[PDB]
Amino acid sequence: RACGLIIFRRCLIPKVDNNAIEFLLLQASDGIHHWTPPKGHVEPGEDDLETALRATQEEAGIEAGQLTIIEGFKRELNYVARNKPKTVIYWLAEVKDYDVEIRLSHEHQAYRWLGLEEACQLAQFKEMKAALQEGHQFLCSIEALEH
């Protein structure tokens, strides 16, 4: 069981930015070299949301001071990879600074910041595509209500 954060940043230059929202994806060092948001396994006694924050720090080098958790969104994924059952819980979190320093560990070899459509294509897997699309939809609905 793993928990993570769908990390995004806002791109607020109106004529320029094709995508007002970009998602952070990390590419695995091993295996297929899958692309996912930052995530990590739970620890005994650890709250699921604290695991997601901790795993984001460990996998992407993003500290709690550099993020804001967006309340109201949570998505649990259940899938089979290499004939093993997998469960992952994601929350949404916005980075404070567009230029936040991404520091990878040995578990990942690259990162991309991508618009929703390109993030979906890289993520590839259908549950992860759904979760990113649903996260994007939630962010737009929230903006509308505050607007």
Residues that bind Mg ion (CB under 5 A): 46-47, 50
Q: Are 102 and 67 in contact (CB under 8 A)?
A: no
The two three-digit tokens of residue 89, written as one number: 């819980």
Cβ 44 to Mg ion shortest distance, Å: 11
Looking at 2-47, list the stretches that DSSP marks H as alpha helix, in order from N- to C-terminal side: none
The two three-digit tokens of residue 102, written as one number: 């991404």
Q: Are 25 and 119 in contact (CB under 8 A)?
A: yes
Q: Report the C-alpha gap between 66 and 38 in whole angstroms.
A: 14
Closest CB to Mg ion among residues 47, 117: 47
Cβ 47 to Mg ion shortest distance, Å: 4
Q: Report the C-alpha gap between 7 and 135 in whole angstroms.
A: 10
Cβ 52 to Mg ion shortest distance, Å: 11
Cβ 46 to Mg ion shortest distance, Å: 5
Helix 126-146 vs helix 116-123: angle between axes, to the nearest 10 degrees? Answer: 160
